[PDB]
């Protein structure tokens, strides 16, 4: 398993504009288009992102290209972030994937806000961090996905996804 397969499982693949769990306009493999309520504003962002008039619809190839950009940007963001980098550097390969997943879903800023959990992961207190991560809006809003990520940090294996 790898970061791409992991995220593909958590986000799904949709070739037409859709609303995410939060009601925001998205497309592909979890690529947020806009937090704006206008489908028009969304269609505009989409064409800008793809470089063509899509009319709200993209191809598999276009979806995967946006996905490659997003994963790269998530990684680069962690590496540039003063709060995230040290955590990332301290982790094993599997756990690194779990932090990338959080950043992809919620943004650098959002994850950087999980101060206490970050501290526990850095210290390698697995069970404690898992319990702390679950006390969040994130967990209450998307519990199945959060549990998968949480188990990953807890165990350092891909068990939560070898089901899926």
Curated annotation (Swiss-Prot):
It catalyses: Hydrolysis of (1->4)-beta-linkages between N-acetylmuramic acid and N-acetyl-D-glucosamine residues in a peptidoglycan and between N-acetyl-D-glucosamine residues in chitodextrins. The keyword Hydrolase applies. This is Endolysin. It holds the Pfam family Phage_lysozyme. Induction: Expressed late in the viral replication. Its EC number is 3.2.1.17. It comes from the Viruses. Keywords: Antimicrobial, Bacteriolytic enzyme, Cytolysis, Glycosidase, Host cell lysis by virus, Host cytoplasm, Hydrolase, Viral release from host cell. It is an enzyme of class 3 (hydrolase). Optimum pH is 7.3. Substrate binds at residues 32, 104, 117, 132. SUPFAM superfamilies: Lysozyme-like. The active site is at 11 (proton donor/acceptor), 20 (proton donor/acceptor). The gene is E. The keyword Hydrolase applies. InterPro entries: Endolysin_T4_type, Glyco_hydro_24, Lysozyme-like_dom_sf, Lysozyme_dom_sf, Phage_lysozyme-like, T4-type_lysozyme. It comes from Enterobacteria phage T4 (Bacteriophage T4). It is found in: Host cytoplasm.
